[PDB]
Amino acid sequence: SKLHLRVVTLIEHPFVFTREVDDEGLCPAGQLCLDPMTNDSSTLDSLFSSLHSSNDTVPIKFKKCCYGYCIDLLEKIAEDMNFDFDLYIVGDGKYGAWKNGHWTGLVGDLLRGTAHMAVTSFSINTARSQVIDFTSPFFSTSLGILVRTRDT
């Protein structure tokens, strides 16, 4: 029928924005996404099941529209490879780096097996490639520095 997936994204401008939902709830020019602020899979599964059901009891604070560059990429890929997606945001939202043996954040919710694809500004590098598999680059960047206001 259709491949159902759940994907995770972080709030970072300009690749992902945050637009407040309308009164009825449609997320025009975008898709609806949630943020239960939790790093355990069971609650995420339960909330997605309740939302995609005839009875959806979830706080409005957990609903908020999100759109932009990276979400546009996700939308194209979903159209082309005919899969439907649900969306959520990391509990802490800190990318991910090694801490207390295990990992944290994005790669720490990938290895822990909760969402099947992570799409956001995501600087792949050595220590991350050898644990989390990555695709080919779709953008280049650098490490620029910005001083305080002009001179004064």
Resolution limit in angstroms? 4.1
DSSP-H helix ranges across the chain: 41-51, 69-80, 105-110
> CA–CA separation, 46 vs 41, rounded Å?
9
Instruction: Consult the annotation and say whether 123 binds a ligand.
Output: yes
Instruction: Consult the annotation and say whether 129 binds a ligand.
Output: no
**Phi-psi region at 87: left, alpha or beta (left = phi > 0; alpha = psi -120 to 50):** beta
Q: CB of 7 within 8 A of CB of 85?
A: yes
Write down the experimental method used for this entry. cryo-EM
- Strands of the sheet containing 117-118, edge to edge, are 63-66, 31-34, 83-89, 3-9, 117-118
Cα 133 to Cα 33, 62, 116, 117: the distances in Å are: 25, 30, 12, 11
Instruction: Consult the annotation and say whether 54 binds a ligand.
Output: no
> Which structure tokens are listed for 51?
């939302």
